[PDB]
Write a protein that binds this ligand. Structure first.
Ligand SMILES: Cc1noc(C)c1CN(C)C(=O)C(C)(C)N
Lengths: 300, 237
């Protein structure tokens, strides 16, 4: 089990770690989060009490370094930093543990939620979507735009998701216009899976990362990317059976985890009705269709 | 965006544009089978592609063989329309290619946009105008060339005959849409009006009769009356 220590908490803030969250008061004696499961990426995220504008946070993997948070009063946010000195950091983590100034990552033993949401998410792929190569962790916030959004403005602060555009020469073979537009299998299997992502695991990893950024930061371009990646599969008549079965599991846990009260802004009615009731795969997403119909029957 | 009453004079400016109407691409007669089921029989169709400024009509005849062995013909028809319009554009010299293509039915937007990806600078637009181009097959000479076709064929017409020698494009389009609206509302009456006076003929190289300016005013008034006459007969007013 790993630990993210905090030098202090000088401003009142709601702190999230993965799907969990807790409130810290101004100058409360909080010095971080312990018992973080090894083996998964994690996200530690923030929403200030005095300005809920900007949720922001950091994707990290404790296997890649020793990371801690300290608030910067100049830039006005909690920053993630790496300590190279293992000895000193291990000592800092121990002294804080002894004084019981840390919250415990509150994972129920039965509970596979976080694994199920991050199954295909790798830190090495996050760092190619979020470019800041001098750090081992990745900063995301509510306002960051995607490369695709920027084409339709600061490039260094963008989310470099794979561009998906159903009315593009990449998506449409000359002479197969109707075929490729009505059945997106060529675009899914040859262009995206074989060509760009190399395998379905990398595709699912980007899909899952896009969802998590939409949910945790309200990042609108991330929500667009998540839905586009769903729609590209659902709109394909020829999808490997193992991908359909895995997609159903991925979406099920995503819909299960979504706050009931954020559905109006995180779920696109057109995409979901198309995918569940019109598309080629309308009968291939049994688990997802059942949870959607029982949890969000209004959307449908 | 969409073309409507507010931006109507844009049709007659000097930016090349084409209307595309796909109504008459896929045409069928519905009939009973020996077993008492229903079946369709396709008949030849046409794409109606019109430059409203010049009157140039690119009538692409759609022969029934294009449907042989195909499924979902009403959907295929929009894509075949878009394929043929795209082929037409590629066939034109660069300086004759349209800047905009206005489709008369919104279901043509995606088929045409996808077929025109190679032309990102050609705008594909809908319209809120209810244009009467479906009645094109009530123009005898157009109907004749479509029905007589034994293979795919493109035939070029000027739908304004020689009117532009005497009137502006705006007025010529207004006359055309009035004529077509009448033929669409009551084809028999409309055609009676157009031919009632045997001394006025249709030239071999024209589609409509050789009316004088004064006779066109009379004809135009008779067409308006017809549209109103039918409108009362229809709604009881
Ligand atoms: C808190 C916490 N976690 O790891 C470390 C390391 C600290 C304390 N940090 C702030 C330090 O000692 C220096 C000054 C080098 N940044």
């Amino acid at each position: 089990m790993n630990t993210v220590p905090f030098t202090s908490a000088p401003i009142e803030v709601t702190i999230g770690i993965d799907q969990y969250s807790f409130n810290v008061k101004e100058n409360q004696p909080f010095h971080g989060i312990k018992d973080i499961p090894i083996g998964h990426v994690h996200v530690i995220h923030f929403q200030h009490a005095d300005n809920s504008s900007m949720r922001y946070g950091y994707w990290f993997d404790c296997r890649m370094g020793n990371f801690y948070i300290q608030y910067d009063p100049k830039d006005g946010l909690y920053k993630m930093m790496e300590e190279r000195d293992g000895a000193k950091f291990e000592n800092i983590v121990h002294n804080f543990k002894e004084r019981q100034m840390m919250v415990s990552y509150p994972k129920i033993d039965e509970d596979d939620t976080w694994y199920n949401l991050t199954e295909f998410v790798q830190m090495d792929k996050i760092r190619k979507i979020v470019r800041k190569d001098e750090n081992q962790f990745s900063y995301v916030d509510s306002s960051m735009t995607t490369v695709q959004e920027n084409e339709l403005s600061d490039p260094a602060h963008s989310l470099n998701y794979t561009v998906i555009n159903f009315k593009s020469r990449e998506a449409i073979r000359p002479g197969h216009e109707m075929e490729d537009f009505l059945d997106k299998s060529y675009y899914l299997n040859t262009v995206m899976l074989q060509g760009i992502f190399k395998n379905s695991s990398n595709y699912f990893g980007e899909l899952q990362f896009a969802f998590l950024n939409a949910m945790f930061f309200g990042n609108y371009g991330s929500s667009l990317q998540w839905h586009a990646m769903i729609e590209l599969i659902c709109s394909s008549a020829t999808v490997p059976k193992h991908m359909l079965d895995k997609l159903d599991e991925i979406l099920y846990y995503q819909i299960k985890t979504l706050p009931e009260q954020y559905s109006d802004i995180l779920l696109n009615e057109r995409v979901w009705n198309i995918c569940l009731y019109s598309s080629f795969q309308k009968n291939s997403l049994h688990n997802t269709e059942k949870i959607m119909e029982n949890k969000y029957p209004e959307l449908l | 965006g969409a073309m409507n009453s507010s931006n109507y004079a844009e049709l007659f400016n000097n930016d090349i544009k084409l209307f595309v109407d796909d109504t008459n691409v896929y045409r069928v007669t519905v009939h009973k089978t020996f077993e008492g089921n229903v079946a369709t029989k396709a008949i030849n169709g046409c794409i109606f592609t019109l430059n409203p400024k010049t009157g140039h009509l690119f009538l692409k005849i759609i022969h029934t063989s294009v449907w042989a062995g195909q499924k979902r013909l009403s959907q295929l028809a929009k894509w075949k329309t878009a394929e043929e319009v795209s082929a037409l554009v590629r066939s034109l010299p660069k300086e004759e290619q349209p800047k905009q293509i206005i489709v008369t039915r919104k279901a043509m937007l995606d088929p045409l946009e996808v077929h025109m990806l190679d032309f990102p600078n050609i705008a594909i637009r809908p319209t809120e105008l209810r244009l009467p181009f479906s009645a094109a097959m009530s123009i005898d000479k157009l109907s004749d060339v479509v029905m007589k076709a034994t293979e795919p064929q493109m035939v070029l017409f000027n739908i304004y005959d020689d009117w532009l020698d005497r009137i502006s494009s705006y007025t010529a389009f207004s006359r055309l849409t009035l004529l077509l609206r009448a033929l669409k509302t009551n084809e028999e009456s409309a055609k009676m009006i157009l031919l009632s006076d045997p001394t006025i003929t249709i030239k071999s190289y024209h589609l409509w009769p050789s009316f004088t300016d004064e006779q066109w005013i009379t004809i135009e008034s008779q067409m308006r009356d017809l549209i109103l006459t039918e409108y009362g007969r229809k709604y009881n007013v």
